[PDB]
Design a protein around this ligand. Structure first.
Ligand SMILES: CO[C@@H]1O[C@H](CO)[C@H](O)[C@H](OCc2cn([C@@H]3O[C@H](CO)[C@H](O)[C@H](O)[C@H]3O)nn2)[C@H]1O
Ligand SMILES: [Cl-]
Ligand SMILES: [Cl-]
Length: 139
């Protein structure tokens, strides 16, 4: 049975290198967006935002939100998600960046702008997905 979206996954004591977060789900048909939000309190340390129809293009927007202001976006035109299809997102925390693979293929990395990794204590998962699983493990 699917989890309820938007879904909140506590990250006890924040994130740390060698921490692997795995999100399993299926994209809804005619999906418009997906969002992962690694949060430090109200701040979003790492925002991972696949957009299925931005001016008829598919793009993943990544960014950080500090004191309610979004920063400079990082955009990646490789777009492995497809409406209707099951996906696996793996977010591996490394010393200098978040490393994201989708369906076992490296997708992008996002350098740490928020430095207090052990305060990034919650992951919000939202958008047009049926969420199957969300978990973490130390590798
Ligand atoms: C290609 O240009 C863009 O096209 C967009 C529509 O597809 C919008 O018009 C953008 O400007 C408005 C905007 C800003 N944002 C926020 O960006 C955050 C990450 O930086 C987060 O994703 C945040 O949720 C989200 O609302 N969303 N829309 C515009 O810059
Ligand atoms: Cl699609
Ligand atoms: Cl910080």
């Amino acid at each position: 049975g699917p989890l309820i979206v938007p879904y909140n996954l506590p990250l006890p004591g924040g994130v740390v290198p060698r921490m692997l977060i795995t999100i399993l789900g299926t994209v809804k048909p005619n999906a418009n967006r997906i969002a992962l939000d690694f949060q430090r309190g109200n701040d979003v340390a790492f925002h991972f935002n696949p957009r299925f129809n931005e001016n008829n293009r598919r793009v993943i927007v990544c960014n950080t939100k500090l004191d309610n202001n979004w920063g400079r976006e990082e955009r990646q035109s490789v777009f492995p998600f497809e409406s209707g299809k099951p996906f696996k997102i793996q977010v591996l925390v490394e010393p200098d960046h978040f490393k994201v693979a989708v369906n076992d293929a490296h997708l992008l990395q996002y350098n740490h702008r928020v430095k207090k990794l052990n305060e990034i204590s919650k992951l919000g998962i939202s958008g047009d997905i049926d969420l199957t699983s969300a978990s973490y493990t130390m590798i």
